[PDB]
Design a protein around this ligand. Structure first.
Ligand code: HEM
Ligand code: HEM
Ligand code: HNI
Ligand code: HNI
Lengths: 141, 146, 141, 146
């Protein structure tokens, strides 16, 4: 469960990300595809090379979903309901992969938020991404 | 992994009693029922709507037999699983786009199917040896991913 | 989420186990220690010799907790509340190990329930043990 | 596990800029803050009740130096990580009773600390190389468990 401090930390950090959310989303995906090649099995129709327009576009979508989750941090199961349906029933991404994207998102944030990424904020962001991941895999079976 | 002479003996001894056809079909079928997202690779197999439809599906059974047959051949290469499964590793990565986590899920289901069939004969030490094998085969099949 | 069908399958299967639960719990622990030796890092204070009375006693406690969870399958967070506190704040077992014990419990049930361990029941039991694991790790951070 | 010569050179180049003592204390501290159940091994270290209590804990800092010191020495032996870390693997299993999952968590935190420190210099290709390294080190430390 996200604590009051967690939610304060997540909102502050994502607020600092600001207009860069889409950029950071694309970067996190690139980091994931390079660091964890098995995740590429879910994107065989994508151009996954550096500078990919498809990755850039997807990055925006992922970022937008996270921004919405932050806006509805006390009701994420319902805010992310359609997205959870999509992953559970159509895309059918194995649940183990959500930790991989979450880690790459953390690394991206760490690389861009020197002052903001304190150990406490680090902890809160990790919990937040784990919670988003839990919601996105909640309808798999 | 690395099996001891005693574990290698236990693995081979039990495998000599395995109906690969039945166990292969059961294992793939239960994979698709217990972890239904794994059905994503088998749209062309037809009806997978219910557990009974999955378990009785001719293509599921065919394809379970083929998979466990290759598994069986691998048991003759226990000290070089990576070498023997190198070709199939590349195939599953580049041609089939199969997340290697699926290999681990199938391994765990296979252990359940063996326990279900053999009962008390599937002792904790025998299970432990087979856990080493299914882990080794999963790791071997994932090894050439890129 | 455990479906009404899941709850029916779990209650029926555990009913069949009956008074054998304690025994099966000890067997599942033995299977876990042998198959996944890293789990022994949580029991260096135990006697792990063959037929260990200490392991048998612990298996009984684990089994009893599962029996209680089945009896309260509609309200497991509350039924397992004290146990969740214990694992989160004292024992502090890494969450990855709960999947290992769950698998060994499944294998144990499979070996003792030839008629009952259908694919559907297999699926329901796996979901149930995952749900128990989720509750037991819910207060870790 | 293994890296391309381009990746080995990238790892070595970045590490030359790393203050191992400081990064070690930071990594161990963040491990205990982000995954607080890992505090179970360090009851003798005193106050671990708040993030600041953890990060500035003298014993946490001292141990972080020791741990990353051994990590750093191992970077000279990327072709033989299992051999390099064999005695530490045995020690963490037999004497310290440390679940090897902790090594994987530390690796993840270390990658975050490097990203935090180096910023844009910690490029996705450089991260990928270090992911190979921390996975290899965690696997090596896990290898002699029994
Ligand atoms: C925090 C975690 C994640 C979030 C917030 C997220 C969000 C999204 C969103 C918003 C979409 C587009 C939905 C639409 O177009 O209607 C999407 C699609 C998709 N996602 Fe996820 N996702 C996450 C994790 C993952 C992971 C880990 C994988 C695989 C490794 C994955 C694989 C996919 C794929 C394959 C698509 C379809 C892309 C396409 O065909 O264009 N997702 N995701
Ligand atoms: C379904 C999963 C689990 C259940 C139902 C369960 C249940 C229990 C129960 C009932 C106790 C005794 C509580 C008491 O005496 O007050 C206990 C203690 C303990 N559990 Fe868990 N547990 C589970 C998972 C795990 C796992 C996966 C591990 C480690 C691999 C673990 C490690 C321990 C340890 C070390 C103790 C203390 C034993 C002692 O010192 O006597 N548990 N657990
Ligand atoms: C995701 C599910 C999945 C799993 C867990 C899995 C696990 C395994 C394992 C693990 C023991 C082995 C030994 C194995 C071996 C094989 N697989 Ni797998 N495979 C899987 C999905 C496939 C698919 C999909 C195909 C192609 C089937 C087809 O229709 O062509 C396949 C095809 C094969 C073939 C046929 C190759 C050829 O055409 O030459 C072999 C052999 N395999 N597979
Ligand atoms: C979360 C727990 C944990 C982790 C992740 C971890 C990860 C690592 C890694 C990973 C890169 C390395 C190289 C490493 C190296 C070392 N550890 Ni670890 N250790 C851990 C828990 C310990 C503990 C506990 C000790 C004993 C500390 C003490 O109190 O003396 C220890 C002691 C050591 C020592 C000193 C050995 C001795 O006393 O003879 C070295 C060297 N280590 N540790």
């Amino acid at each position: 469960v996200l604590s009051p401090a967690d939610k304060t930390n997540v909102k502050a950090a994502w607020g600092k990300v600001g207009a860069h959310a889409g950029e950071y989303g694309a970067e996190a995906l690139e980091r994931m595809f390079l660091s964890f090649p098995t995740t590429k099995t879910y994107f065989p129709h994508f151009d996954l090379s550096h500078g990919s327009a498809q990755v850039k576009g997807h990055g925006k979508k992922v970022a937008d979903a996270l921004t919405n989750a932050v806006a509805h941090v006390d009701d994420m199961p319902n805010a992310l309901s359609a997205l959870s349906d999509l992953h559970a029933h159509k895309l059918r991404v194995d649940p183990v992969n959500f930790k991989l994207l979450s880690h790459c998102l953390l690394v991206t944030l760490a690389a861009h938020l020197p002052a903001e990424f304190t150990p406490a904020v680090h902890a809160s962001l990790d919990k937040f991404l784990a919670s988003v991941s839990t919601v996105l895999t909640s309808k798999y079976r | 992994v690395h099996l001891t002479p005693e574990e290698k003996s236990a693995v081979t001894a039990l495998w000599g009693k395995v109906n690969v056809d039945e166990v292969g079909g059961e294992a793939l079928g239960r994979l698709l029922v217990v972890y239904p997202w794994t059905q994503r690779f088998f749209e062309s197999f037809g009806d997978l709507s219910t557990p009974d439809a999955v378990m009785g599906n001719p293509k599921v059974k065919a394809h379970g037999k083929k998979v466990l047959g290759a598994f069986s051949d691998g048991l003759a290469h226990l000290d070089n699983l990576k070498g023997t499964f190198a070709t199939l590793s590349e195939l599953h990565c580049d041609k089939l786009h199969v997340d290697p986590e699926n290999f681990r899920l199938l391994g765990n289901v296979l252990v359940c199917v063996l326990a279900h069939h053999f009962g008390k004969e599937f002792t904790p030490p025998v299970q432990a040896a087979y856990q080493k094998v299914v882990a080794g085969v999963a790791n071997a099949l994932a090894h050439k991913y890129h």
